[PDB]
Design a binder for this molecule. Structure first.
Ligand SMILES: [Mg+2]
Ligand SMILES: [Mg+2]
Ligand SMILES: [Mg+2]
Ligand SMILES: [Mg+2]
Lengths: 283, 289
């Protein structure tokens, strides 16, 4: 089975999580984890970036070799998400669909409006009961989606649940969450609207009037972004500033390679800065 | 780093996330005291401050409390049928939303009805509950000054369970809060969340929701000081042996020179092993309509 390995020191700029492939070789979280999309069973594989109730802004890096998960930084400073009261850190496990990409050139057939893709793998929110570690790859059941608009880009949020959650069989479309998990859709919607306000940013807004899109519509977003990724790795797109497509597993692709990376020994994990625990109370 | 003056502190006994875990009060000379009896409440009516004993740090689930039954009144995790008790995650809260604790040298008498409520309703037999809404996360067994802001008259299993809202006096925002309305206006969602939390938090354990006096309104600072005074007065009668009842708390104490319970504690500090794992079900979320 796929697994992961930590490099460097937790809560320092050296921290990384790499994908380990089945033979022990290093792969890319972006390119080498099969999405494993099953349109019939409405399941696909998520890469977990941020465990529920964690603040560190871990993401799959498009820049570092082999696309490890690294903590975001600004002005050289590690970035922590705020506590949007009464949330502690992220309210659910946050991650991505591997082998997907929101092209900032191919404008979506699914929105009537000429709006940009956000240039990253599709964002995934796992609302299940399990707290999942950074670098976990697991099957999730696709439920619905939220069309967040952040800085002119369509930042889709796809709501899923871990297929190991006994409750997953009780949820077969996005209205099931509203009825059976009271408060989850409302809280995620408000979180994504306001989470940058404490950093000096304006509230985000929504397409579709702020309404969640159902499973059938969401599956089309996933398929489209999986096809965009496909075109990207096959060299079948013309465009500047395309992500790296270096990969360990995709035969005949230009980026196909063997990854040679240094796994740095982990030191005494640094303290999180105490100000990370401050709460943000948003009107 | 280095304190030139003696201060109260605490000592952990046993293993975290195990039935052995205990935090004891250490008095200025290093001996063991009671968190219930031996921490001066320090109530200052004019500055609207008093000392809190912190039981549960913000975003912790473990239901730590001052034990009325254990010798020297350590803070211990509530346990039932030999099973450690954890508070639920009342979505979207993670554990307790703020630092939770108590006012030492206070007690809600279960004998008397308060003269401050227009209603016959008995107290909950424990120190007054305190909720510190400040930015700092405080460790179990911390004693610190807090500014009293207001209170909520929760009713739980028929008993009046006062919740006192306070802020750590070191919080730079403390100066901007002078009464319970400043929290409502300047810390949007805090009072709302606490009130809903106290209404629903035992529903996952199979209890009906709690109710309130004063129609679920918060009481202001002036009224709250009267509740704290009255509970401090009743604590005093308890330790002075002036009350009759079959299940009064123990009044054993190290520091109160004129009390029957005044004693020297001899407690064992057990070696701490590596903290046990919290059971993974403690991370499940409760979604209450
Ligand atoms: Mg992302
Ligand atoms: Mg996105
Ligand atoms: Mg209490
Ligand atoms: Mg109480």
């Amino acid at each position: 089975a796929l697994s992961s390995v930590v490099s460097g020191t937790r809560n320092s700029p050296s921290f990384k999580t790499y994908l380990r492939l089945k033979d022990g070789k290093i792969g890319s979280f972006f390119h080498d984890v099969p999405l494993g999309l099953d349109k019939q069973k409405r399941i696909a594989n998520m890469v977990v970036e941020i465990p529920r109730w964690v603040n560190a802004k871990y993401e799959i890096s498009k820049d570092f070799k082999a696309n490890p998960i690294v903590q975001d930084t600004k002005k050289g400073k590690l970035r922590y998400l705020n506590n949007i009261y009464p949330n502690h850190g992220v309210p659910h496990n946050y991650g991505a669909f591997p082998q997907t990409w929101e092209s900032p050139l191919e404008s979506s057939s699914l929105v009537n409006q000429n709006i940009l893709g956000d240039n990253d793998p599709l964002d995934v929110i796992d609302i299940g009961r399990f707290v999942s570690s950074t670098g976990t790859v697991k099957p999730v059941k696709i439920l619905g989606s939220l069309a967040l608009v952040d800085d002119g880009e369509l930042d889709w949020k796809v709501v899923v649940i871990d297929t190991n959650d006994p409750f997953a069989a009780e949820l077969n479309d996005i209205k099931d969450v509203y009825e059976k998990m009271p408060g989850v859709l409302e809280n995620l919607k408000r979180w994504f609207e306001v989470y940058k306000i404490p950093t000096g940013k304006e509230p985000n807004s929504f397409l579709f009037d702020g309404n969640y899109k159902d499973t059938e519509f969401t599956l089309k977003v996933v398929q489209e972004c999986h096809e965009n990724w496909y075109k990207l790795v096959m060299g079948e797109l013309h465009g500047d500033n395309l992500p790296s497509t270096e990969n360990a597993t995709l035969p005949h692709t230009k980026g196909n390679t063997v990854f040679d990376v240094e796994i740095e020994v982990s030191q005494k994990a640094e303290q999180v800065p105490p100000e990370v625990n401050d709460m943000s109370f948003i009107k």
